[PDB]
Design an enzyme around this catalytic site. Sequence first.
Site, short mmCIF file in Angstrom:
data_model
loop_
_atom_site.label_atom_id
_atom_site.label_comp_id
_atom_site.label_asym_id
_atom_site.label_seq_id
_atom_site.Cartn_x
_atom_site.Cartn_y
_atom_site.Cartn_z
N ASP A 273 0.82 -1.20 0.00
CA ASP A 273 0.00 0.00 0.00
C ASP A 273 0.86 1.26 0.00
OD1 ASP A 273 -2.87 -0.55 -0.12
OD2 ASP A 273 -2.58 -1.60 1.80
N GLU A 315 -0.80 -1.99 -4.98
CA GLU A 315 -1.98 -1.08 -4.93
C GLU A 315 -1.57 0.30 -5.44
OE1 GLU A 315 -2.78 1.71 -2.32
OE2 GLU A 315 -4.90 1.32 -1.94
#
Lengths: 639, 628
Positions: A273, A315
């Site tokens: 992330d 991501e």
Amino acid sequence: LTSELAAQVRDAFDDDRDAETFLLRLERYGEDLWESLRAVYGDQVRALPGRLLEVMLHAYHARPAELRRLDEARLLRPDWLQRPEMVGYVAYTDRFAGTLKGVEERLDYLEGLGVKYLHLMPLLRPREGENDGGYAVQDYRAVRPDLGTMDDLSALARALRGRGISLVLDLVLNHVAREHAWAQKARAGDPKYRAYFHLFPDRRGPDAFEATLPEIFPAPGNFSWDEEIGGWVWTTFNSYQWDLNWANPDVFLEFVDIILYLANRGVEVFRLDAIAFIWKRLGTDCQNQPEVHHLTRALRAAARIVAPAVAFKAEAIVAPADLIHYLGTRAHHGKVSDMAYHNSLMVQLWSSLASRNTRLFEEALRAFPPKPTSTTWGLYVRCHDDIGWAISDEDAARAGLNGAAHRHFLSDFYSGQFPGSFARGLVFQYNPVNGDRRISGSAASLAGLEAALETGDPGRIEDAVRRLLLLHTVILGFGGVPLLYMGDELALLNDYAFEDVPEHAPDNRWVHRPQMDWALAERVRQEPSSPAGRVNTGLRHLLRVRRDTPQLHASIESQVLPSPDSRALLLRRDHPLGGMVQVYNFSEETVMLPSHVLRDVLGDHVQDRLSGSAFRLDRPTVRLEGYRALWLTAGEAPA
Amino acid sequence: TSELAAQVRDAFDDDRDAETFLLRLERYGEDLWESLRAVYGDQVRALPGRLLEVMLHAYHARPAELRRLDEARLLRPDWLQRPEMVGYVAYTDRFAGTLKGVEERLDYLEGLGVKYLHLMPLLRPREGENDGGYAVQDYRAVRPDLGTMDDLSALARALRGRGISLVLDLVLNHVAREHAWAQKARAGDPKYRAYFHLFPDRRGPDAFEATLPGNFSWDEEIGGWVWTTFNSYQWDLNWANPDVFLEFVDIILYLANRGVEVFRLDAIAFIWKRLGTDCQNQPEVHHLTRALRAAARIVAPAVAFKAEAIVAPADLIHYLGTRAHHGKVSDMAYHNSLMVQLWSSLASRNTRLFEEALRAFPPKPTSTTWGLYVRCHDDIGWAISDEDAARAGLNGAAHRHFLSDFYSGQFPGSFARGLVFQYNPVNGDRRISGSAASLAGLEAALETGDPGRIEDAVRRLLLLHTVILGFGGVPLLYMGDELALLNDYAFEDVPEHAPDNRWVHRPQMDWALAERVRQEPSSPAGRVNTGLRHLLRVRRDTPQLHASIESQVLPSPDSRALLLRRDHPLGGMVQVYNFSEETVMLPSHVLRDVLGDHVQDRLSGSAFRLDRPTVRLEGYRALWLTAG
């Protein structure tokens, strides 16, 4: 790889076979690792190989025997993620089954569905108070206390392994909570930890960067004042979220240690992330920097050495030109993050469903560059996010449309505003710069089931059921891991009880983030001809067919076959057992699709894998009912 | 799956072995069991357990060093495809006398860059006539003059140390009449009688011979007929008997444990008989290969198979695997077509035929690999099909007659000095013997002393070797082509060789001559030697030559030139070959459209400016152009 490293390695192991395995793996992936660290840290301290290797050796020793076996299994099957049997399910631990112990109680449900990839929403221990929904991590080696402990996570992983399910976690690479041990050691002024962040004495550095940065909360700002540095810290996202300084190799080592720690607790796939943000360079937007790839490549190589079973998923929602780098270009080609997200496909599904037109879809897929064949898209119809209309102006142009006009239409449509729309979404963000809006809402509410239930009309209810099934068919056949979002299989509608819940009320994304009702799930299994039941059995059938169609192997990309009718989308997939063409009608109306375009790739006789029925392509047209999907392959003609 | 699990788990003192075996059996189990069923029916159900007994025993005996190579192979499944791979093909005796002798010359091989050594048949043949080693008396022994299995095993330990793989010929289709099995069958043990195709009277033989395009032989204690495709002392095994399958899994794993890394499966096309057919390329062939291949995947991941079948292209592709067999029937087949087109174009000074033949060739599975050669221990037959010739504007048989006329020396002012090996009294189709250097014109040129014609011959040899080094796949250097050895005319003095003029291109290695050539860089052989070692060095450093990527034909505006495109993530490559003596001016756009504005020839190091209308390409020159 010198004589020194090899001897260190050789003397670090009681068993000779361990030493050999480690060494063979180090030879195999050494190139990837050292070349990449050099490109990032240059002539460094040079002490780094040796410190990295201590981390890797420690982790390897602590790696339990069952996870080493999974390791060899993965080497026998490198393409495990690409197999058609692969099906993903995405849920919040608490909202699915209360706790991690609770999730064990529901494995029969998951294994029954055919799920082999379970992605739980962020669960590493966050700071207390506001936490950007779990992206403000306080300790990466602990779990949020309400969900259980690391032990619990470790056990849930053993259970999932036993049903052949991989556990998938979110790992924030870019920043820690201001309450993280490192952030505290830095505020108590230990120079080592001060160097884990971007720290500034005066207002000048901050000003020099802010010249070229755009803002992520349109809190506004990229830097924050803290008493005990006074002084400024780099804070992309929120103020309680301190950017780590990846230009310091000590940070790299912390993360290889954390990744291998969690891997040894049974994490199989890491969703990395805020990966786009991890490298700062004056003069740039500080996103998608070259160094990001070199670091990913090095992290991936350490994981290849100690834990072959592990894979990474990136991501980053970014334009396609940018996204392709996260799967690897030039030097890297799968040596970085293995999985990613195909945000474009999700956007084009809803767009075409609203527009009843698929030219834009064709164009978006044609402009998409080919991925490395060893990597894999993650495909979804919905997730825990709002939907933003990521439709580029060049793509819109090639379709004969204006980007802004089309995107305004979609927000107008999916909000419920547009006349005769089937959708019932909520507006999440309104941007006064562009006018651009972002939509909340569940798959079932957006596909028209909410609207249709208010009317009672059987015809509009059927349309909604068939739209949900059509969307899921596309992601199940496109190539890649379909990520079913929790409760889409039960066709859950927008939930408005989140408003009565004071912590959710401000943020209307909770509208599409319901509590799983286990009684309702039992009801749906036993009412096959309700709407939910129609969706549930329809989806269970598509998952069964997917798991038995070899042509859906993800190493093969779907090619667009330009369509003679803008209501239809056609996709071709080449494979040794014989080609497949997928045919989707994005309209309510019956489409008489001209035969030539399919005849040209498949021949005269074909058979739909989905329903079983045959078709002759030596006929001028093929009848496609509304929202009908065919998976055509070659067949015969005895009759 | 249940029966195997328990057996397996107890069959091992060490747990890690049990686990590895089990994981591998799960991974490759489908491949194996599905295939045996398709061949032997669900009739024979004792078989999984008998096969497993063979596999477990072999695995136990597999030495620690070979298990490590096994893991290394799993870490790099594409080992055969890396640009680093270079093959060398030789007869043990004619290279270094004995197997012990070969060890003494490893510095030569490692120095050349060789990572794949294919020694000509050495499993113990029958005494007397032996079809040059294809009549095998015992698969677990070596021809006595060459050494013993223990010698073979040691030579493998030495080769492994320099990162070279040993490659052997395993005849699947038939054994020598003196093989133990053939004698157990003559003494009438029913079990061994069932290893062959046996017939009591002449009915049966007649039914087959209808469609076979002798095939049977009379023997006293078999009085009856045995199936014998080649010669008579060579008895076809009956692969419809599962006992034969198990014999070969046992042999393959035995030799693998002695350090063989690649098996050339000989006469594989013939192993399945079916009434009514030519008894070649039967589907069962693939099912059997797939099962043998899966047993090897389980016990010895390090091992690979190479299929020896010269067959039209449409047929050849099945040996690499189609439909469900994709990448299971082999990891390697010979690209006989490319070799034929090299010589044809060199003679014709024209590459239309080459373009056509490559276009009609179907794509291979990407995990498999061509073996490419300019020459080998064989005669050359002109395998040019009539369809390919047609699409090129040529008459098949007219072109084929030309090539034999050219390479024999008959055609007026030909540079070639070959010998005719076979003459057809029907088509007039001929076969050619001769070494690369004799066929490329160096023998002729040395008779004249002319510097200009000697240079032409050197550049022809280099051009041919460049194509196979850049085409994608393992280049199989034939022993002594790097020294430009000419036809040896002392084979007639050998009474055993004189009948068979293929010995003309099968010389003894002269180690003194090899040392002379290293030290005389501007002799002819030295120019070839230097030029070759340079091409091998460049190949080993060009990632775009990874064999998973196929060379595509870029249609050429000049019939003197062949252009090949290779797509790759680091950026494309275009290869340009001139098959004539004359300078070629290629238009620039054809390269600018694939590579961009600025390029680099990896072969010479120089840059190229496509901003000119044309690009000069001197005679017999090769470019390996990439961007940058």
